[PDB]
A paper describes a structure:
Phytases (myo-inositol hexakisphosphate phosphohydrolases) catalyse the hydrolysis of phytate into inorganic phosphate (Pi) and lower phosphorylated myo-inositols. Here we report the identification of two HAPPs from the enterobacteria Hafnia alvei (HaPhy) and [name] (YkPhy), together with biochemical studies of their pH and temperature optima, as well as their phytate degradation pattern, which show that they are 6-phytases. The two-step reaction involves a nucleophilic attack on the phosphorous by the histidine from the RHGXRXP motif to form a covalent phosphohistidine intermediate while the aspartic acid of the HD motif serves as a proton donor to the oxygen atom of the scissile phosphomonoester bond.
The structure of Pi-YkPhy was refined at a resolution of 1.67 Å with two protein monomers in the asymmetric unit, each modelled with residues 6 to 414, and with very similar folds (rmsd = 0.22 Å). The overall fold is essentially identical to that of apo-HaPhy (rmsd = 0.96 Å over 391 residues) and is shown in Fig. S6 in the same orientation as for HaPhy in Fig. 5(a). Each monomer contains two Pi molecules in its active site. The first Pi superposes almost perfectly with the 6-sulphate from the HaPhy-MIHS complex. The second is coordinated by His126 (corresponding to His128 in HaPhy) similar to the 1-sulphate of MIHS, but does not superimpose with any of sulphates of the MIHS ring. The YkPhy structure is very similar to that of HaPhy, with a very close overlap of the active site residues, suggesting that it is also a 6-[name] in accordance with our biochemical data.
Numbering used by the authors: 6 to 414
Write the structure that this text describes.
Amino acid sequence: GYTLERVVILSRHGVRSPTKQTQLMNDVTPDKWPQWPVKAGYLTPRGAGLVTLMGGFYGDYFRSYGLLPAGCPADESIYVQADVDQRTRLTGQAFLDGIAPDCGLKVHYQADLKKIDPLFHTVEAGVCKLDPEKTHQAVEKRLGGPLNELSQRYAKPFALMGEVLNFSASPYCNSLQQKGKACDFATFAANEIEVNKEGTKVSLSGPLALSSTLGEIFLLQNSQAMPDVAWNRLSGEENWISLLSLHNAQFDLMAKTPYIARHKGTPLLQQIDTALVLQRDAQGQTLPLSPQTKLLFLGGHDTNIANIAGMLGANWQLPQQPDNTPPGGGLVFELWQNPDNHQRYVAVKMFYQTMEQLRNADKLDLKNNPARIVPIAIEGCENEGDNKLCQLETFQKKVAQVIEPSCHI
Protein backbone atom coordinates (compact mmCIF):
# COMPACT_ATOMS: atom_id res chain seq x y z
CA GLY A 1 0.00 0.00 0.00
CA TYR A 2 1.51 3.36 -1.07
CA THR A 3 1.90 6.28 1.35
CA LEU A 4 0.25 9.63 0.51
CA GLU A 5 2.98 12.11 1.47
CA ARG A 6 1.75 15.47 0.31
CA VAL A 7 -0.91 17.17 -1.76
CA VAL A 8 -1.31 20.41 -3.72
CA ILE A 9 -4.77 21.49 -4.79
CA LEU A 10 -5.07 24.12 -7.54
CA SER A 11 -8.71 25.09 -6.94
CA ARG A 12 -11.08 27.25 -8.90
CA HIS A 13 -13.20 29.52 -6.78
CA GLY A 14 -16.85 28.49 -6.16
CA VAL A 15 -20.06 29.61 -7.69
CA ARG A 16 -19.92 33.30 -8.52
CA SER A 17 -22.15 35.81 -10.27
CA PRO A 18 -21.42 36.56 -13.91
CA THR A 19 -18.69 38.85 -15.07
CA LYS A 20 -19.93 42.39 -15.84
CA GLN A 21 -22.73 42.48 -18.38
CA THR A 22 -21.81 44.03 -21.77
CA GLN A 23 -24.07 45.59 -24.41
CA LEU A 24 -23.27 42.67 -26.71
CA MET A 25 -24.51 40.12 -24.14
CA ASN A 26 -27.75 42.09 -23.87
CA ASP A 27 -28.22 42.57 -27.62
CA VAL A 28 -27.89 38.87 -28.65
CA THR A 29 -31.16 37.94 -26.93
CA PRO A 30 -34.59 39.54 -26.74
CA ASP A 31 -34.97 38.18 -23.20
CA LYS A 32 -33.89 39.78 -19.93
CA TRP A 33 -30.93 38.34 -18.01
CA PRO A 34 -31.73 37.20 -14.44
CA GLN A 35 -30.24 39.41 -11.76
CA TRP A 36 -27.84 38.08 -9.07
CA PRO A 37 -27.65 38.70 -5.31
CA VAL A 38 -24.05 39.92 -5.37
CA LYS A 39 -21.79 42.22 -7.28
CA ALA A 40 -20.41 41.03 -10.63
CA GLY A 41 -17.77 38.39 -10.21
CA TYR A 42 -18.27 37.81 -6.52
CA LEU A 43 -18.65 34.47 -4.86
CA THR A 44 -22.24 34.04 -3.72
CA PRO A 45 -23.12 32.91 -0.19
CA ARG A 46 -24.48 29.67 -1.70
CA GLY A 47 -21.12 29.27 -3.58
CA ALA A 48 -19.22 29.56 -0.28
CA GLY A 49 -21.58 26.93 1.18
CA LEU A 50 -20.77 24.58 -1.70
CA VAL A 51 -17.05 25.10 -1.32
CA THR A 52 -17.41 24.26 2.42
CA LEU A 53 -19.20 21.00 1.40
CA MET A 54 -16.25 20.23 -0.88
CA GLY A 55 -13.79 21.06 1.93
CA GLY A 56 -15.57 18.44 4.00
CA PHE A 57 -15.11 15.89 1.21
CA TYR A 58 -11.47 16.72 0.84
CA GLY A 59 -11.08 16.25 4.57
CA ASP A 60 -12.83 12.84 4.52
CA TYR A 61 -10.69 11.72 1.51
CA PHE A 62 -7.28 12.83 2.77
CA ARG A 63 -7.98 11.66 6.32
CA SER A 64 -8.81 8.22 4.85
CA TYR A 65 -5.22 8.06 3.52
CA GLY A 66 -3.80 9.36 6.86
CA LEU A 67 -2.50 12.58 5.33
CA LEU A 68 -4.28 14.59 8.07
CA PRO A 69 -5.30 13.34 11.53
CA ALA A 70 -8.83 13.27 12.93
CA GLY A 71 -9.89 16.65 14.38
CA CYS A 72 -7.79 19.82 14.07
CA PRO A 73 -4.70 19.46 11.83
CA ALA A 74 -1.14 19.71 13.15
CA ASP A 75 -0.23 23.41 13.01
CA GLU A 76 1.40 24.54 9.80
CA SER A 77 0.33 21.25 8.10
CA ILE A 78 -2.16 23.07 5.80
CA TYR A 79 -1.30 26.30 3.95
CA VAL A 80 -3.91 28.14 1.96
CA GLN A 81 -2.87 30.84 -0.51
CA ALA A 82 -5.48 32.74 -2.56
CA ASP A 83 -5.45 35.26 -5.36
CA VAL A 84 -6.48 38.81 -4.33
CA ASP A 85 -10.08 38.60 -5.58
CA GLN A 86 -13.03 38.30 -3.21
CA ARG A 87 -14.02 35.05 -4.91
CA THR A 88 -10.66 33.40 -4.41
CA ARG A 89 -10.09 34.68 -0.82
CA LEU A 90 -13.52 33.64 0.30
CA THR A 91 -13.16 30.27 -1.46
CA GLY A 92 -9.92 29.64 0.39
CA GLN A 93 -11.61 30.41 3.72
CA ALA A 94 -14.75 28.39 2.85
CA PHE A 95 -12.41 25.45 2.05
CA LEU A 96 -10.73 25.64 5.51
CA ASP A 97 -14.09 25.94 7.23
CA GLY A 98 -15.02 22.65 5.59
CA ILE A 99 -11.75 20.71 5.99
CA ALA A 100 -10.90 22.01 9.53
CA PRO A 101 -14.00 23.59 11.15
CA ASP A 102 -13.35 25.64 14.38
CA CYS A 103 -9.55 25.30 14.07
CA GLY A 104 -8.72 29.01 13.62
CA LEU A 105 -7.05 28.41 10.26
CA LYS A 106 -6.92 31.30 7.80
CA VAL A 107 -6.58 31.96 4.11
CA HIS A 108 -3.45 33.96 3.16
CA TYR A 109 -2.93 36.28 0.24
CA GLN A 110 -0.81 39.06 -1.15
CA ALA A 111 -0.33 42.09 1.19
CA ASP A 112 -1.78 44.62 -1.26
CA LEU A 113 -5.16 43.54 -2.61
CA LYS A 114 -5.26 46.53 -4.94
CA LYS A 115 -2.40 45.11 -7.10
CA ILE A 116 -2.27 42.05 -9.32
CA ASP A 117 -0.58 38.91 -7.97
CA PRO A 118 2.06 37.70 -10.45
CA LEU A 119 1.69 34.13 -9.25
CA PHE A 120 -1.89 34.03 -10.57
CA HIS A 121 -1.58 36.65 -13.33
CA THR A 122 1.97 36.37 -14.58
CA VAL A 123 1.69 37.98 -18.01
CA GLU A 124 -0.67 40.74 -16.67
CA ALA A 125 1.95 41.58 -14.02
CA GLY A 126 4.54 41.98 -16.82
CA VAL A 127 6.82 39.11 -15.64
CA CYS A 128 7.14 38.04 -19.29
CA LYS A 129 5.50 39.26 -22.48
CA LEU A 130 3.55 37.53 -25.25
CA ASP A 131 4.76 38.29 -28.74
CA PRO A 132 1.82 39.04 -31.03
CA GLU A 133 3.01 36.98 -34.09
CA LYS A 134 4.04 33.98 -32.00
CA THR A 135 0.73 34.08 -30.17
CA HIS A 136 -1.29 34.05 -33.41
CA GLN A 137 0.91 31.25 -34.88
CA ALA A 138 0.57 29.15 -31.74
CA VAL A 139 -3.21 29.47 -31.49
CA GLU A 140 -3.41 28.40 -35.25
CA LYS A 141 -1.30 25.38 -34.50
CA ARG A 142 -3.51 24.49 -31.51
CA LEU A 143 -6.75 24.88 -33.44
CA GLY A 144 -5.50 23.17 -36.65
CA GLY A 145 -6.18 26.10 -38.91
CA PRO A 146 -7.58 29.65 -39.19
CA LEU A 147 -10.14 31.06 -36.80
CA ASN A 148 -12.81 31.39 -39.48
CA GLU A 149 -13.12 27.57 -39.44
CA LEU A 150 -14.61 27.69 -35.94
CA SER A 151 -18.05 28.25 -37.46
CA GLN A 152 -17.96 24.81 -39.07
CA ARG A 153 -16.05 22.99 -36.32
CA TYR A 154 -18.65 24.14 -33.75
CA ALA A 155 -21.62 24.47 -36.11
CA LYS A 156 -24.11 22.50 -33.96
CA PRO A 157 -23.07 24.15 -30.65
CA PHE A 158 -23.33 27.61 -32.20
CA ALA A 159 -26.76 26.80 -33.63
CA LEU A 160 -27.86 25.59 -30.22
CA MET A 161 -26.60 28.83 -28.61
CA GLY A 162 -28.59 30.88 -31.07
CA GLU A 163 -31.67 28.81 -30.18
CA VAL A 164 -31.14 29.19 -26.48
CA LEU A 165 -30.79 32.96 -26.96
CA ASN A 166 -33.64 33.20 -29.40
CA PHE A 167 -31.07 35.14 -31.41
CA SER A 168 -33.28 35.50 -34.50
CA ALA A 169 -35.57 37.76 -32.44
CA SER A 170 -32.70 39.80 -30.89
CA PRO A 171 -31.64 43.44 -31.41
CA TYR A 172 -28.28 42.20 -32.77
CA CYS A 173 -30.01 40.09 -35.40
CA ASN A 174 -32.21 42.97 -36.41
CA SER A 175 -29.07 45.16 -36.81
CA LEU A 176 -27.71 42.52 -39.21
CA GLN A 177 -30.99 42.27 -41.14
CA GLN A 178 -31.14 46.05 -41.51
CA LYS A 179 -27.71 45.89 -43.24
CA GLY A 180 -29.02 43.01 -45.44
CA LYS A 181 -27.14 40.22 -43.61
CA ALA A 182 -28.59 36.87 -42.45
CA CYS A 183 -28.70 36.01 -38.77
CA ASP A 184 -26.35 33.11 -38.50
CA PHE A 185 -25.21 33.06 -34.87
CA ALA A 186 -21.92 31.28 -35.66
CA THR A 187 -20.86 34.16 -37.95
CA PHE A 188 -22.45 37.21 -36.27
CA ALA A 189 -18.96 38.73 -36.26
CA ALA A 190 -15.41 37.52 -36.88
CA ASN A 191 -13.43 35.55 -34.32
CA GLU A 192 -10.32 37.76 -33.73
CA ILE A 193 -7.34 37.58 -31.40
CA GLU A 194 -5.71 40.80 -30.15
CA VAL A 195 -2.35 40.95 -28.23
CA ASN A 196 -1.88 44.43 -26.84
CA LYS A 197 1.21 46.40 -27.77
CA GLU A 198 2.83 45.81 -24.35
CA GLY A 199 2.43 42.00 -24.72
CA THR A 200 0.63 41.90 -21.34
CA LYS A 201 -2.86 40.86 -22.50
CA VAL A 202 -4.29 38.52 -25.07
CA SER A 203 -7.99 38.74 -25.81
CA LEU A 204 -10.47 36.94 -28.03
CA SER A 205 -13.52 38.66 -29.50
CA GLY A 206 -16.44 37.39 -31.54
CA PRO A 207 -18.83 34.44 -31.47
CA LEU A 208 -16.64 31.89 -29.72
CA ALA A 209 -15.62 34.39 -26.99
CA LEU A 210 -19.20 35.46 -26.39
CA SER A 211 -20.47 31.88 -26.38
CA SER A 212 -17.82 30.84 -23.87
CA THR A 213 -19.04 33.54 -21.50
CA LEU A 214 -22.74 32.91 -21.97
CA GLY A 215 -22.49 29.14 -21.56
CA GLU A 216 -20.72 29.71 -18.23
CA ILE A 217 -23.46 32.06 -17.18
CA PHE A 218 -26.07 29.39 -17.74
CA LEU A 219 -24.00 26.84 -15.84
CA LEU A 220 -23.65 29.32 -12.97
CA GLN A 221 -27.38 30.00 -12.94
CA ASN A 222 -27.96 26.26 -12.62
CA SER A 223 -25.28 25.86 -9.96
CA GLN A 224 -26.78 28.78 -7.94
CA ALA A 225 -30.14 26.92 -7.99
CA MET A 226 -31.93 29.73 -9.81
CA PRO A 227 -35.42 28.60 -10.81
CA ASP A 228 -35.20 29.60 -14.49
CA VAL A 229 -32.02 28.75 -16.25
CA ALA A 230 -31.46 30.06 -19.83
CA TRP A 231 -35.15 31.04 -20.08
CA ASN A 232 -36.17 27.38 -19.83
CA ARG A 233 -34.66 26.80 -23.30
CA LEU A 234 -31.75 24.59 -22.26
CA SER A 235 -32.50 21.00 -21.24
CA GLY A 236 -30.71 17.67 -21.61
CA GLU A 237 -27.29 16.36 -20.89
CA GLU A 238 -25.99 16.39 -24.47
CA ASN A 239 -27.25 19.93 -25.08
CA TRP A 240 -25.38 21.03 -21.98
CA ILE A 241 -22.23 19.32 -23.17
CA SER A 242 -22.54 20.73 -26.69
CA LEU A 243 -23.21 24.31 -25.47
CA LEU A 244 -20.30 24.24 -23.00
CA SER A 245 -17.98 22.84 -25.60
CA LEU A 246 -17.74 26.40 -26.95
CA HIS A 247 -16.51 27.52 -23.48
CA ASN A 248 -14.06 24.67 -23.32
CA ALA A 249 -12.78 25.38 -26.82
CA GLN A 250 -12.23 28.99 -25.95
CA PHE A 251 -10.18 27.91 -22.89
CA ASP A 252 -8.23 25.44 -25.01
CA LEU A 253 -7.26 28.07 -27.57
CA MET A 254 -6.73 31.00 -25.24
CA ALA A 255 -5.40 29.33 -22.14
CA LYS A 256 -4.04 25.89 -23.11
CA THR A 257 -2.12 26.68 -26.31
CA PRO A 258 1.34 25.92 -25.01
CA TYR A 259 3.02 29.24 -26.06
CA ILE A 260 0.39 31.09 -24.00
CA ALA A 261 0.09 28.48 -21.25
CA ARG A 262 3.84 28.30 -20.53
CA HIS A 263 4.12 32.12 -20.33
CA LYS A 264 1.07 32.42 -18.04
CA GLY A 265 1.56 29.23 -16.05
CA THR A 266 5.25 28.98 -15.25
CA PRO A 267 5.04 30.48 -11.74
CA LEU A 268 2.07 28.33 -10.69
CA LEU A 269 3.64 25.17 -12.10
CA GLN A 270 6.82 25.85 -10.22
CA GLN A 271 4.92 26.68 -7.00
CA ILE A 272 2.94 23.45 -7.34
CA ASP A 273 6.00 21.37 -8.04
CA THR A 274 8.18 22.84 -5.33
CA ALA A 275 5.41 22.67 -2.69
CA LEU A 276 4.64 19.10 -3.66
CA VAL A 277 8.19 17.85 -3.12
CA LEU A 278 8.66 20.42 -0.35
CA GLN A 279 11.82 22.06 -1.67
CA ARG A 280 11.20 25.10 0.50
CA ASP A 281 14.09 27.24 -0.78
CA ALA A 282 13.98 26.26 -4.43
CA GLN A 283 13.38 28.89 -7.11
CA GLY A 284 9.63 29.34 -7.64
CA GLN A 285 8.66 28.38 -4.09
CA THR A 286 7.16 31.69 -2.98
CA LEU A 287 5.31 30.74 0.22
CA PRO A 288 6.33 30.43 3.90
CA LEU A 289 5.85 26.70 4.01
CA SER A 290 6.92 24.68 6.99
CA PRO A 291 8.74 21.29 7.01
CA GLN A 292 5.47 19.77 8.31
CA THR A 293 3.45 21.00 5.33
CA LYS A 294 1.06 18.24 4.10
CA LEU A 295 -1.41 20.20 2.02
CA LEU A 296 -1.20 23.45 0.01
CA PHE A 297 -4.44 24.86 -1.37
CA LEU A 298 -4.10 27.44 -4.15
CA GLY A 299 -7.28 29.52 -4.61
CA GLY A 300 -7.25 30.53 -8.33
CA HIS A 301 -9.13 30.58 -11.58
CA ASP A 302 -10.21 28.41 -14.47
CA THR A 303 -7.52 30.09 -16.53
CA ASN A 304 -4.87 28.87 -14.09
CA ILE A 305 -6.05 25.29 -14.24
CA ALA A 306 -6.16 25.51 -18.07
CA ASN A 307 -2.66 27.02 -18.24
CA ILE A 308 -1.27 24.16 -16.11
CA ALA A 309 -3.13 21.56 -18.17
CA GLY A 310 -1.80 23.10 -21.38
CA MET A 311 1.82 23.03 -20.11
CA LEU A 312 1.42 19.40 -18.99
CA GLY A 313 -0.32 18.22 -22.21
CA ALA A 314 -3.40 17.26 -20.15
CA ASN A 315 -6.87 17.03 -21.63
CA TRP A 316 -10.04 15.72 -20.03
CA GLN A 317 -13.83 15.51 -20.03
CA LEU A 318 -15.76 15.44 -16.76
CA PRO A 319 -18.80 13.19 -16.54
CA GLN A 320 -21.89 15.15 -15.49
CA GLN A 321 -19.97 18.44 -15.52
CA PRO A 322 -19.83 20.08 -18.93
CA ASP A 323 -17.32 22.76 -17.91
CA ASN A 324 -13.84 21.29 -17.90
CA THR A 325 -12.78 23.88 -15.28
CA PRO A 326 -16.01 23.94 -13.20
CA PRO A 327 -16.94 26.06 -10.20
CA GLY A 328 -15.32 24.76 -7.12
CA GLY A 329 -13.33 22.14 -9.09
CA GLY A 330 -9.74 21.38 -8.17
CA LEU A 331 -6.78 20.06 -10.11
CA VAL A 332 -5.15 17.92 -7.39
CA PHE A 333 -1.49 16.80 -7.30
CA GLU A 334 -0.68 13.89 -4.99
CA LEU A 335 2.80 12.67 -3.99
CA TRP A 336 2.78 8.92 -3.29
CA GLN A 337 5.60 6.67 -2.07
CA ASN A 338 6.16 2.92 -2.31
CA PRO A 339 7.47 2.25 1.21
CA ASP A 340 9.17 -0.95 0.01
CA ASN A 341 11.56 0.56 -2.51
CA HIS A 342 11.15 4.28 -1.68
CA GLN A 343 10.10 5.11 -5.25
CA ARG A 344 7.91 8.24 -5.34
CA TYR A 345 5.11 9.00 -7.83
CA VAL A 346 2.90 11.93 -8.80
CA ALA A 347 -0.78 11.49 -9.47
CA VAL A 348 -2.99 14.18 -10.94
CA LYS A 349 -6.81 14.27 -10.53
CA MET A 350 -9.75 16.64 -11.14
CA PHE A 351 -12.00 16.71 -8.03
CA TYR A 352 -15.40 18.27 -8.69
CA GLN A 353 -19.12 18.47 -7.99
CA THR A 354 -21.50 17.43 -10.78
CA MET A 355 -24.16 19.85 -12.01
CA GLU A 356 -26.69 18.08 -9.82
CA GLN A 357 -24.41 18.15 -6.75
CA LEU A 358 -24.02 21.90 -7.11
CA ARG A 359 -27.70 22.61 -7.87
CA ASN A 360 -28.98 20.49 -4.97
CA ALA A 361 -26.17 21.40 -2.54
CA ASP A 362 -25.68 17.67 -1.85
CA LYS A 363 -23.88 16.70 1.36
CA LEU A 364 -20.79 14.76 0.21
CA ASP A 365 -19.24 11.60 1.67
CA LEU A 366 -16.80 8.88 0.66
CA LYS A 367 -19.39 6.10 0.16
CA ASN A 368 -22.92 7.13 -0.79
CA ASN A 369 -22.45 10.49 -2.60
CA PRO A 370 -18.82 11.37 -3.23
CA ALA A 371 -17.45 14.29 -5.16
CA ARG A 372 -16.27 13.02 -8.54
CA ILE A 373 -12.61 12.22 -9.00
CA VAL A 374 -11.12 11.83 -12.51
CA PRO A 375 -7.51 10.73 -12.95
CA ILE A 376 -5.62 12.94 -15.44
CA ALA A 377 -2.98 11.68 -17.89
CA ILE A 378 0.18 13.81 -18.23
CA GLU A 379 1.97 13.97 -21.60
CA GLY A 380 5.39 12.20 -21.48
CA CYS A 381 4.72 10.58 -18.07
CA GLU A 382 4.26 6.84 -17.44
CA ASN A 383 0.46 7.25 -16.72
CA GLU A 384 0.60 3.82 -15.20
CA GLY A 385 -2.37 2.05 -13.68
CA ASP A 386 -5.79 3.37 -12.76
CA ASN A 387 -4.27 6.33 -10.85
CA LYS A 388 -2.14 7.26 -13.94
CA LEU A 389 1.00 7.49 -11.85
CA CYS A 390 4.09 9.33 -13.11
CA GLN A 391 7.48 8.42 -11.63
CA LEU A 392 8.68 11.42 -9.62
CA GLU A 393 11.92 11.82 -11.61
CA THR A 394 9.91 11.71 -14.87
CA PHE A 395 7.48 14.33 -13.60
CA GLN A 396 10.33 16.62 -12.45
CA LYS A 397 11.92 16.24 -15.89
CA LYS A 398 8.65 17.14 -17.61
CA VAL A 399 8.22 20.25 -15.46
CA ALA A 400 11.77 21.40 -16.31
CA GLN A 401 11.07 20.90 -20.03
CA VAL A 402 7.84 22.90 -20.18
CA ILE A 403 8.59 25.90 -17.97
CA GLU A 404 9.52 29.12 -19.76
CA PRO A 405 12.84 30.26 -18.12
CA SER A 406 12.03 33.88 -18.80
CA CYS A 407 8.69 33.60 -16.82
CA HIS A 408 10.20 32.77 -13.33
CA ILE A 409 8.40 34.74 -10.61
